[PDB]
Write a protein that binds this DNA or RNA. Structure first.
Lengths: 103, 113, 188, 81, 55
RNA sequence: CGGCGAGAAGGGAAGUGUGUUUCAAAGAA
RNA sequence: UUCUUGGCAUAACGUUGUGUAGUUAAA
RNA sequence: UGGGAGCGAAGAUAAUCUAAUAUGUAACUCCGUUCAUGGAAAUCAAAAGAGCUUUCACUGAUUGUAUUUAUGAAACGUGAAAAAAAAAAAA
């Protein structure tokens, strides 16, 4: 209401925090590929900081076991740690969906 | 009404998937356990199904109305409420049928729980 | 909501229609008169029924039936000795609720003197307090020991001598009559 | 502040304590106690509200149970001290 | 009780907000507060029941 | 080149997880 | 191009409701 | 006076009957209507925020109570009219 009719309010309100359902919906749309803009809570950041490391740990195994223990190619052409962690987190958060087969 | 003397048995899956089947047998074979190999969608595999040894004051509309009106013998309803509460139910999130017990003013908005 | 001490918790924040159409036969048990806002009764105004008055109740069976019946309060006859009035008050209709509050207050004179009118719910107690203050004001008349009901009216307080005179006169008359009545039917 | 304190002295200085009953009595002279919920229940309108609702009673039961848990935390401090 | 109610104090707070002074006369101004949204939710019970069943 | 007069009852209500919000049973056209 | 199968009933099960049972990590 | 308080049945509908509607309606008693009623939060909301009381419109015949027949100016919220915290230690 405030956003659509700013003229109706003498003093503009403050953005409220989302609940569990809305946070899940926003994170779901982020996977779809919509630019989501909202403040993140602390419980999610805390959990993700560990989840990313866990997923990285699991990924490394598959790499090293095979034999490819050391990376190759140009240093300026390989992926970054943040991108790798984001990709692993997205893969993890879509294991129970049909979209995994398309990967 | 039906005059059938046939007993009612209950076959349960061996996988603990909460899968059950319905059938009938003769009354003479009272002390006989039935075991089959049926499809179980819970595991997408053929599993064993064994006959289970399946074994109170009933509540009617009249009784319900009486209770609700007078307020006598409310423990019968309170026991069901406690059971429901104990079991996974009345959850704030991911629930439409009965997300909450009552509204702020003390009302049950969901007709079908 | 507001006024939690009073009945009708679930009736204030509702539609006007609900309030207007509210029925009285929907309540089985009685409700306190103070909480319900019921008007005092004539029998209560003539006694000391602190939290007691005529109430109503309804019944209900398994057949969804309902009725309404009247119920009377519990009243007792006793005697109280008032030191300030200097006269006995026989046959005082009281109740256990008032009796209890008398204990708390300290007695019969202090109960009447230190009870607010809204809690007393009795005009007879206000008249007795008035008479007590009149005796306080006028010790001389206090010595006579006449019944407290003689000076109940304001005109009797304005003219106390006349009141005692008339009381004695009428007592004389009554006894005179009685004597004759008896002598007429005397056996001997 | 000084001035205010001079004029706002207490009424219970250099006096012995009082029973809880007495305290209650004192309270009564200013403020009244709330009405029992047992009676209040009846106030519900049959038009929009169910007189005797099992869920409504269960909510009050849970609140009453939580009250004791709240009281225990306050009571533990005296034993600790 | 105070002379002025909270109801009326909200008007003074709104006037302060209009005048750009956020709020100074607060019970706790200099003390941090943990937002309710920063809490860790437990989630429904059916999830855990199903997980236990699967196990 | 902004730095501890840093407080306002300990009581009511709200989810029954409340580190959260609000309020003061007690004043006049 | 795959050789078969979702019983048996010449009398076929009482609809709806209640109770019981089952379902809701979504816009 | 279809205003407010006490008490308060039936004909009728459910094509008989119980609940229920009629209706807290009719009769009886009392207050006598804007100089009235009401009222300046231990309220509502839930993570934003509104700010005594009162009238109209919409939300909405939605939610709810019932069922064999009905009843229901619901709560939050929006628009609009009227806008009112306290004259105050005494002389």
């Amino acid at each position: 209401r405030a956003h659509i009719k700013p003229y109706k309010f003498e003093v503009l309100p403050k953005t409220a925090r989302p609940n569990l359902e809305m946070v899940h919906y926003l994170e779901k749309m982020r996977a779809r590929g919509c630019v989501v803009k909202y403040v993140k809570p602390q419980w999610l950041i805390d959990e993700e900081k560990s989840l990313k490391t866990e997923l990285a740990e699991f990924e490394a195994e598959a790499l090293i076991a095979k034999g490819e223990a050391i990376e190759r190619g140009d240093p300026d052409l390989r992926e970054s740690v943040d991108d790798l962690q984001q990709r692993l987190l997205k893969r993890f958060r879509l294991r129970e969906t049909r979209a995994a087969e398309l990967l | 009404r039906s005059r059938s003397k046939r007993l009612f048995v209950q076959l349960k899956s061996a996988a603990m998937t909460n899968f059950c089947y319905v059938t009938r047998k003769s009354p003479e074979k009272k002390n006989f356990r039935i075991a089959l190999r049926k499809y179980d969608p819970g595991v997408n595999k053929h599993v064993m199904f064994y006959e289970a040894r399946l074994p109170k004051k009933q509540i009617t509309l009249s009784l319900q109305r009486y209770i609700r009106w007078t307020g006598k013998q409310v423990k019968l309803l309170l026991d069901k409420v406690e059971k429901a509460w104990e079991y996974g139910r009345f959850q704030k999130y991911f629930d439409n049928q009965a997300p909450l017990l009552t509204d702020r003013r003390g009302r049950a908005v969901p007709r079908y729980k | 909501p507001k006024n939690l001490n009073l009945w009708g918790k679930y009736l204030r924040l509702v539609g006007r229609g609900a309030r207007r159409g509210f029925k009285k036969w929907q309540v089985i048990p009685p409700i306190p008169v103070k909480a319900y806002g019921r008007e005092p009764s004539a029998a209560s105004q003539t006694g000391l029924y602190h939290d007691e008055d005529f109430n109503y109740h309804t019944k209900r069976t398994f057949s969804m039936r309902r009725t309404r019946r009247k119920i009377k309060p519990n009243v007792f006859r006793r005697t109280f000795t008032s030191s300030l009035l200097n006269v006995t008050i026989p046959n005082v209709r009281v109740t256990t609720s008032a009796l209890h509050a008398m204990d708390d207050m300290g007695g019969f004179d202090a109960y009447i003197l230190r009870t607010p009118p809204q809690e007393l719910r009795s005009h007879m107690g206000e008249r007795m307090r008035q008479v007590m203050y009149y005796y306080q004001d006028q010790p001389a008349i206090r010595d006579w020991g006449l019944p407290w009901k003689v000076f109940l009216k304001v005109a009797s307080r304005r003219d106390p001598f006349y009141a005692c005179y008339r009381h004695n006169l009428r007592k004389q008359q009554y006894e005179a009559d009685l004597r004759s009545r008896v002598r007429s039917f005397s056996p001997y | 502040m000084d001035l205010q304190n001079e004029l706002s002295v207490h009424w219970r200085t250099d006096r012995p304590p009082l029973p809880d009953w007495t305290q209650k009595q004192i309270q009564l002279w200013q403020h009244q106690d709330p009405l029992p919920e047992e009676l209040q229940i009846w106030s519900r309108t049959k038009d929009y509200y169910k007189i005797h609702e099992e869920r409504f009673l269960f909510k009050l039961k849970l609140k009453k149970e939580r009250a004791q848990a709240k009281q225990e935390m306050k009571q533990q401090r005296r034993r600790l001290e | 009780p105070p002379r002025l109610s909270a109801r009326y104090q909200a008007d003074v707070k709104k006037q302060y907000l209009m005048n750009n002074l956020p709020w100074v006369w607060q019970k706790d101004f200099y003390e941090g507060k943990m937002h309710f949204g920063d809490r860790e939710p437990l989630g429904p019970k059916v999830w855990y029941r199903k997980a236990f069943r699967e196990e």
